[PDB]
Design a protein around this ligand. Structure first.
Ligand SMILES: O=C(O)Cn1c(C(=O)O)cc2ccc3ccccc3c21
Ligand SMILES: O=C(O)Cn1c(C(=O)O)cc2ccc3ccccc3c21
Lengths: 341, 341
């Protein structure tokens, strides 16, 4: 897998070439295109590329190898990068909205000297680049319109999710009462699971000619569920994670996030435990956050997670058995294996 | 005309109804949809509606009246409102980027208590609403894909323009040297003229079945030129405008805008006039701005505008004669009449 991830990053350079070149018939806009190039190179590079890579892996497993000519695979590479650009667009914008300082250990684009709120237009350009690529590489393909609509629906759903999330954790408002499990699962589904798990596989499906509404509804049932586990596990690792094997240290408590952990804690917790979480959930002081962390362990949450994970794992297998056909189960199982590890 | 503008605003209420109702099968997202409703009603209402209205006017003049059934006209109403939503999206975002205080005399959405930078996601939702409407009302139409692509290209071109503009007038940097006429016309074309004049007419064209590349290239030649005059005249009225008949007072000098006025001034101006504009172009003090205003009149700019306008007017007529056919010239002349007045 981590060999294919090399050929994927490899293609970025062509993606950039093809995008930063309508200045050919239009030298007028050269300065703008140069900024676009810089936006792409700062923001589309430096993550794990797993979503876009999933398009390519899925594509191979879905389409005949004798159908996999140089051009087909080229479009697979481009659509996966389209997923990554959709992500880069969300992240640049999300970083501004919640005033983050760093992303991928690195300085947030909007925080760089001389960028600031201009990053809002930068973010929008990242979104537009998706549709320029699709038209450049897929205009003639029969699934063309399908992919445009899929990308657009994924944008809209993520944005609804971001809204839900922003209503839910108004930065400057610690109201633990709106952190229900039902609102949690609703936020994970729209803001994270649709574009992170359904979109990549759906894209490869359409590219492989599988446009059937039932097949997508079935692939969606599996992927949304995998997405829900993914975020739940991420909320768990944020805190109890091993900061060495993860990649950074977590701050969900220090940000009043509607984390899975805190939904669980509140779902339990005597009314004294209620009002001591309602006391430390937000501040930057390591004494106050480690207090809640403690209250979590005291409620055995890490245990109820480890139970949840095993239950979640058997549920997803039951889902693959039931709803994978006639797609090769490998397409879902390859994913499950990498998320649940 | 100002009777049709009534039936257009009238339709907004249905637009909102149809948009704020996927919560039907999805009560989970109710709070998000309510925020969307509030975003639409604050931001899509309160301007002059001329761009969207142009779609409808153009549609009637392009398609047979016996082809104009209740459903056709319904889609015309929706696509025009789609233009308005594309605009509301740009404006909400542009207001944040240059820290404006008011828009349409009213408080900028992002400046309202409790909104702030969340308006970035709000802006994106406005954009997404375009494509939800197009799919809801035009999915089955043969020009469906054409309109998606037209809206997407209009987004991308406006965004390139906004980039060009932001590179050009770095708020915090008064370098009068990058205010060339060529950079000016390049900024007006991408950021303003494509979506303001080409998009509305192009949309009606596609809806009326006129998808021919040459016809659009010809309609584009006229409309881009009309757009250039529109912005140039707007830059002129910003300052020398009569604040009573305009609608508000101008600030282009107080903002270091790459205005037509200042491009002209610099294109003239002895090197003492160079360095006194290079002295007052930006500050808020009414003494320093009225200084430049004076320097403008001293260079007779208002005269060279009045010459420019007449020349521009005959040029556009020559363009309509040449490039309108086989479209009814009324479609372009109705526009010209309202802009040049
Ligand atoms: O990259 C991540 O954010 C998490 N992740 C990891 C990881 O390195 O932890 C592996 C892996 C594999 C496939 C994925 C598909 C969609 C979304 C995330 C994925 C993913
Ligand atoms: O609304 C405006 O910003 C300027 N304007 C006016 C005005 O009331 O000044 C009339 C009018 C008519 C058609 C238009 C088409 C596209 C863009 C702007 C238009 C427009």
């Amino acid at each position: 897998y981590a060999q294919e991830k090399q050929d994927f990053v490899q293609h970025f350079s062509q993606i950039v070439r093809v995008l930063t070149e309508d200045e050919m018939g239009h030298p007028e806009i050269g300065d703008a295109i140069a900024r676009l190039k810089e936006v792409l190179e700062y923001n589309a590079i430096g993550g794990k590329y797993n979503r876009g890579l999933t398009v390519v892996v899925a594509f191979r497993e879905l389409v005949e190898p004798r159908k996999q000519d140089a051009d087909s695979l080229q479009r697979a590479w481009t659509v996966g990068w389209c997923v990554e650009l959709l992500q880069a667009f969300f992240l640049v914008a999300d970083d501004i909205m919640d005033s983050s300082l760093t992303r991928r250990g690195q300085i947030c684009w909007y925080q760089k000297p001389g960028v600031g709120l201009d990053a809002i237009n930068d973010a929008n350009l990242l979104e537009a680049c998706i549709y320029r690529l699709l038209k450049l590489y897929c205009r003639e393909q029969p699934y063309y319109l399908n992919l445009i609509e899929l990308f657009l629906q994924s944008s809209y759903q993520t944005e609804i999710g971001q809204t839900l999330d922003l209503l839910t954790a108004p930065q400057g408002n610690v109201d633990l009462v709106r952190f229900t499990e039902k609102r949690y699962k609703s936020i994970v589904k729209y803001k994270t699971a649709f574009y992170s798990f359904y979109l990549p596989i759906a894209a490869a499906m359409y590219m492989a000619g599988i446009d059937g509404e039932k097949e997508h509804a079935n692939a969606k049932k599996i992927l949304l569920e995998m997405g829900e586990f993914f975020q739940i596990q991420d909320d768990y690792l944020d805190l109890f994670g091993d900061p060495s094997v993860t990649g950074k240290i977590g701050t969900d408590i220090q940000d009043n996030k509607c984390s899975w952990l805190v939904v669980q804690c509140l779902q339990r917790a005597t009314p004294e435990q209620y009002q001591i979480l309602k006391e430390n959930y937000g501040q930057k002081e390591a004494e106050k956050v480690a207090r809640v962390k403690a209250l979590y362990e005291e409620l055995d949450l890490p245990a109820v997670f480890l139970q949840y994970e095993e239950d979640s794992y058997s549920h997803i297998m039951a889902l693959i058995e039931q709803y994978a056909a006639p797609l090769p189960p490998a397409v879902f199982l390859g994913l499950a294996r990498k998320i649940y590890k």
